[PDB]
Ligand binder design. Structure first.
Ligand SMILES: Nc1ncnc2c1ncn2[C@@H]1O[C@H](COP(=O)(O)OP(=O)(O)O)[C@@H](O)[C@H]1O
Ligand SMILES: Nc1ncnc2c1ncn2[C@@H]1O[C@H](COP(=O)(O)OP(=O)(O)O)[C@@H](O)[C@H]1O
Lengths: 353, 353
């Protein structure tokens, strides 16, 4: 506890990105991508458990002991907030701890096209921000919420496991519920959200069926609902939503999605051509009447063709079209663009044309 | 009357892998893959129970009597560590006991070519070590991991069922997770691995479609991912990964594999011609620009032709080329070499030439 503060302070003071605590090694900090041990004795299982437990609530200790996994965020007064992950290896506790910045970056700093700001102005519907873990999803969502919070006089409710970015009230009323402390579960929080007069709702990952129906219901009843998935493209995202349901109920889900879907953002971070930092590649799908019909008709695989010709009107963009632009601006190398293109032969064709 | 400790000492001393205790047979030890009876009278039910129980705690004895099954590992201080499984057959106790080596062998001692040492230097991507059970896969991976641990300042995470080779921290931080104790399952470990700030991850077998997608994501997000399959050749490895996906998504998977694949090692252990020990036969495919294109163009068949002529530059090597070298050094018989050649007529032509 009194030592855990000192370890996390040293992480901040020395400009490290991640702090590692595990047995038979001293605490180690990642500086410029590479781990460096602190000048301390190696930790034992008593140390790692005491250090990691010193920053947990009783609910988190019981959840950690029930699953041997725990994602969480916590704050240290006067320093910073931190995202921690605690797990078990070779019968002992281990932990990794990252910093959570206080300041939300703008759409421009993040490399987000103007269509993303227009999604933050939608009065209602379902907007999905997808990609793998650490593909920029939380950062993009924080920028969108911060824009809504700055510009609108509405009620934002977020349900998070855990809460990552904090949104102090601006013009909106912003309520943020952390699963396992503020609310028992996503299911329990969503049962009452319509009785809380929301305008904008962040529901997190579309984990299971129960959460998908809540997001579709919120989006169907006139609210703007934000959610994430792990998928890598607009078409793959829509198929993920439909295919989790029983065969008899997939028609209804497809009908609901065609009306309420207002945007799908699929992101991935690629190495910059300079060799330092990462640059955002994003596929943007903004539904037009043609795409909404393809969803209703169970013709999802023909939507990609529609995305190729909807660029000028709605700000839509296939993943290959974004890589083309990153290549002409020399932000990424040809190998990285080809190595990540969902269809390298198409990207080749776009270059010679 | 033989005790447990003398039996386990003989198993180690004779270079055996497994000790078998069951009624109406003498103790038998597996040497070079084949069972051999010890020069002792056959065991009865009193013997098998006394021998297996001699290495159990009181709690372990109780659990065995409740389920008639028990997996465990245990140590003999002056000898070695061991993995035991106790069960019941024909109303009597039976037992199998496996050896867990303490010492990782060098690349030369295992018969791995120098190009395998270079795989430990790869900054990112997917490396596959394939073959049937007990074909040396775990030992090869342990040799690679030890080099990374020695040479890099990065975070290595292994997920194992169970953990075999132990890796004390060297220059890396090494966390080793045993399925069923440290983590609930492979699926659960992989659910949190992206939040654990890893650089190198061992995920075990590409059991199902979901694990392949996890391995491609790790290799795509800047990590070095190691995994195994039960395929027997480089082409069989690439095909089995691609062919599990639906036909409409196989184009993306092939493009991904062409970018992230950094090596495929397909091994098999063959009995030596001398009659003692086993020798490694290995097919090595390291993708070069030509092979990566064959993957993108769906020309997997033609990869075999590239391996036949990529010997001098990149250290590539087909299985038949490896058997030829083992034959000239008289390490294997012609029948053993022929019994494993994927094309016996090709190996014959190489011998007469
Ligand atoms: N648009 C972006 N442009 C550049 N870097 C980004 C962008 N979005 C996120 N990042 C960086 O990626 C890292 C983690 O992103 P994160 O928000 O945790 O993604 P996710 O919520 O999907 O896991 C951070 O260091 C962040 O600065
Ligand atoms: N590269 C190797 N060369 C020679 N013998 C090996 C090699 N790898 C393993 N062995 C021997 O074979 C036995 C079993 O192999 P193992 O490592 O368990 O492969 P797998 O994990 O695929 O089942 C080991 O006890 C070891 O003595």
């Amino acid at each position: 506890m009194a030592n855990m503060h000192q370890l996390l302070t040293e992480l901040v003071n020395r400009g490290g990105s991640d702090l590692h605590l595990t047995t038979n090694s001293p605490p180690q900090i990642r500086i410029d991508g590479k781990l460096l041990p602190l000048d301390m004795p190696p930790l034992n299982a008593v140390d790692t458990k005491q250090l990691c437990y010193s920053i947990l609530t009783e609910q988190q200790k019981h959840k950690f002991e029930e699953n041997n996994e725990l994602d969480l965020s916590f704050g240290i007064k006067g320093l910073s907030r931190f995202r921690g992950n605690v797990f078990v290896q070779r019968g002992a506790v281990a932990g990794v701890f990252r910093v959570i910045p206080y300041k939300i970056l703008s759409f421009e700093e993040l490399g987000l096209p103007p269509v993303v700001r227009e999604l933050a102005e939608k009065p209602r519907g379902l907007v999905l921000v997808t990609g793998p873990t650490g593909s920029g999803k939380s950062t993009t969502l924080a920028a969108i919420i911060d824009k809504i919070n700055t510009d609108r006089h509405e009620h934002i409710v977020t349900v998070e496991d855990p809460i990552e970015y904090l949104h102090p009230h601006k013009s909106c009323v912003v309520n943020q519920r952390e699963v396992g402390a503020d609310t028992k579960s996503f299911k329990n929080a969503l049962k009452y959200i319509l009785r809380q007069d929301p305008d904008v709702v962040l529901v997190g990952e579309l984990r299971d069926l129960e959460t998908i129906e809540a997001a579709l219901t919120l989006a169907e009843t006139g609210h703007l609902c934000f959610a994430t998935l792990h998928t890598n493209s607009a078409v793959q995202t829509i198929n993920r939503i439909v295919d989790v349901f029983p065969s008899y109920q997939q028609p209804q889900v497809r009908a609901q999605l065609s009306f309420v879907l207002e945007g799908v953002l699929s992101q991935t971070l690629l190495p910059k051509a300079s060799g330092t930092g990462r640059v955002l590649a994003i596929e943007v799908m903004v539904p037009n009447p043609a795409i909404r019909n393809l969803i209703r008709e169970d013709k999802i695989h023909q939507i990609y063709s529609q995305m190729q010709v909807g660029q000028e009107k709605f700000g839509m963009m296939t993943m290959n079209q974004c890589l083309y632009g990153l290549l002409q601006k020399r932000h990424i190398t040809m190998d990285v663009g080809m190595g990540r293109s969902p269809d390298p032969d198409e990207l080749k064709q776009m270059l010679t044309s």
